[PDB]
Amino acid sequence: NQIVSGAAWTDTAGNTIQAHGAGILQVGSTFYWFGEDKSHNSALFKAVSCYTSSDLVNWSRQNDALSPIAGTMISTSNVVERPKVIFNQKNSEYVMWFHSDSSNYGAAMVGVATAKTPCGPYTYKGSFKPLGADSRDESIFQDDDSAQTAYLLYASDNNQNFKISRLDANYYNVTAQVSVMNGATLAAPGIVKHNGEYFLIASHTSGWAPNPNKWFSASSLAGPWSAQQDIAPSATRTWYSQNAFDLPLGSNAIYMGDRWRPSLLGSSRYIWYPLDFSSGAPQIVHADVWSVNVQAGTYSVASGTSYEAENGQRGGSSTILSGSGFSGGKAVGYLGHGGTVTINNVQSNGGSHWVALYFANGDSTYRNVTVSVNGGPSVLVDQPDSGGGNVVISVPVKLNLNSGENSITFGSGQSNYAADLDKIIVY
Ligand SMILES: *[C@@H]1O[C@H](CO)[C@@H](O[C@@H]2O[C@H](CO)[C@@H](O[C@H]3O[C@H](CO)[C@@H](O)[C@H](O)[C@@H]3O)[C@H](O)[C@H]2NC(C)=O)[C@H](O)[C@H]1NC(C)=O
Ligand SMILES: *[C@@H]1O[C@H](CO)[C@@H](O[C@@H]2O[C@H](CO)[C@@H](O[C@H]3O[C@H](CO)[C@@H](O)[C@H](O)[C@@H]3O)[C@H](O)[C@H]2NC(C)=O)[C@H](O)[C@H]1NC(C)=O
Ligand SMILES: *[C@@H]1O[C@H](CO)[C@@H](O[C@@H]2O[C@H](CO)[C@@H](O[C@H]3O[C@H](CO)[C@@H](O)[C@H](O)[C@@H]3O)[C@H](O)[C@H]2NC(C)=O)[C@H](O)[C@H]1NC(C)=O
Ligand SMILES: OC[C@H]1O[C@@H](O[C@H]2[C@@H](O)[C@@H](CO)O[C@@H](O[C@@H]3[C@@H](O)[C@H](O)O[C@H](CO)[C@@H]3O)[C@@H]2O)[C@H](O)[C@@H](O)[C@H]1O
Ligand SMILES: [Ca+2]
């Protein structure tokens, strides 16, 4: 099946996937996805989880890869973020690295843990400051030279300076700084190698708030690194996400991001998009609905039918808005609080259909919108802050439609203002 960014994702038992700050690993034909368990809606350490799949889309939850230990730096009072796991051929060993911290991010350490099987459970080997310097946001890159040299990529010196450092032959420690970008203020790194060249994907530092994520290239990890460029339209702030893991997919990649929900962390969503490298400059393919053939290293973007909101039938006091950020140059504003718009003649073969809602929300806070099909009972769809009144992003909703024509009404029966609705795409 299909990869629908922003949706609620469940494992094969029907439970919400809890694997934020993703790290991916493949053994044989099996994919492993490690992440932070945030089901307690806290930034503090509950577990590093472990999900497996054969196809990157249908995940079964295994045993937790890492659990708290009272009286250590991986207690429930500490922070464990962004786990990454690589396989060490020499020792036939799985080495996990993670950002290890205290609750106020004052410790700035890395943590290491090992296992003999992919899901572990792993054995914590302790935390430390690499080469004596800060480490907060980090990742691990394992090169394809014959020594399979591995590297730590990490925000250091109070997040100001971004560093790349070689690990020793066991992957247990950092031996030597290889590259630094002073004052880059980079976070959430990942590296993909493409045609012998290295591509670093990273965010800047802005707290929980998303920002435009960048790519940099170099022909060696020592640098020099090219000047930053956007992987997505700058104003969308990486389509409201933050980089987590960049997984190679044929001659391209999959961008794996988080949409952090700081007021409800366990409902932070997963934003996965194809990251296309053919132009030589990585670009997010903004696909509301796509599928992947991970063995062939190919992706496929679902085609949908677009319906502009401004062509629907308004009701109440909803009015047209204009903006260069809008499809057709127009959107329906003053929705909710009396204002509605109904999209008529939505065609369908029947059954369940993903629908992407394209909207602008210039508030610093979320909005939401009611969505009723054919007069039926409404569901309430969350509408994150989009980055401005002229900035459109999309969130998905799954609607049951009848064979033939359908109507979809937006904004009825809510006392708050919904976001400005640009268009919808029925997939
Ligand atoms: C995602 O992974 C799921 C687990 O591997 C997988 O579930 C399995 O799905 C098949 C088909 O629904 C079931 O197979 C059969 O179920 C009973 C046996 O209990 C048979 O009598 C049936 O005739 C049928 O052959 C499995 O039971 C089911 N396993 C579990 C643990 O649920 C899903 O199919 C996968 N989903 C997708 C979209 O690929
Ligand atoms: C990787 O190399 C690290 C040295 O760079 C090494 O870590 C350091 O580890 C020791 C203990 O293992 C720490 O010492 C202890 O002392 C502090 C007070 O300073 C107390 O919190 C504790 O008593 C603690 O036991 C060092 O301070 C620490 N150095 C840094 C810069 O953080 C790691 O153990 C090595 N890890 C592996 C897998 O090799
Ligand atoms: C649907 O979107 C609504 C916004 O369009 C949202 O309403 C808002 O909810 C927040 C949090 O509940 C309120 O928050 C805070 O501010 C008030 C003072 O204004 C304080 O009393 C609180 O302590 C808190 O700090 C917002 O005031 C409120 N904003 C508006 C315009 O109504 C709904 O929460 C959303 N509904 C769902 C189910 O998510
Ligand atoms: O009050 C209900 C009404 O809200 C409108 O939303 C506006 C607010 O979100 C406002 C919050 O600051 O921002 C407006 O958008 C502007 C933008 O158009 C203008 O260029 O200045 C700044 C950019 O910095 C801001 O982003 C936004 O329009 C709805 O548009 C409207 O339908 C109605 O719901
Ligand atoms: Ca429009």
Author numbering: 22 to 448
Quoted passage from the original study:
The exo-β-1,3-galactanase is a glycoside hydrolase from the basidiomycete Phanerochaete chrysosporium (Pc1,3Gal43A), which specifically cleaves AGPs. In this context, exo-β-1,3-galactanase (EC 3.2.1.145) specifically cleaves the nonreducing end β-1,3–linked galactosyl linkage of β-1,3-galactans to release d-galactose (Gal). In this study, we solved the apo and liganded structures of Pc1,3Gal43A, which reveal a glycoside hydrolase family 43 subfamily 24 (GH43_sub24) catalytic domain together with a carbohydrate-binding module family 35 (CBM35) binding domain.
The crystal structure of the SeMet derivative of Pc1,3Gal43A was first determined by means of the multiwavelength anomalous dispersion method, and this was followed by structure determination of the ligand-free WT, the WT bound with Gal (WT_Gal), the E208Q mutant co-crystallized with β-1,3-galactotriose (Gal3; E208Q_Gal3), and the E208A mutant co-crystallized with Gal3 (E208A_Gal3). In E208A_Gal3, electron density of Gal3 was observed in the ligand-binding site of PcCBM35. The asymmetric unit of E208A_Gal3 contained four Pc1,3Gal43A molecules, and each molecule binds to the nonreducing end of Gal3 (called Gal_site 1), as in other CBM35 modules. The Gal_site 2 interacts hydrophobically with Gly383 and Asp384. However, ensemble refinement revealed that Gal_site 1 and Gal_site 2 do not show huge fluctuations, whereas Gal_site 3 has many conformations. At the catalytic site, Gal−1 is anchored in the appropriate position, and Gal+2 appears to fluctuate in a planar fashion as it interacts with the surrounding residues. In the CBM, it was inferred that Gal_site 1 is fixed and Gal_site 3 is adsorbed at the appropriate location at the binding site while fluctuating in three dimensions.
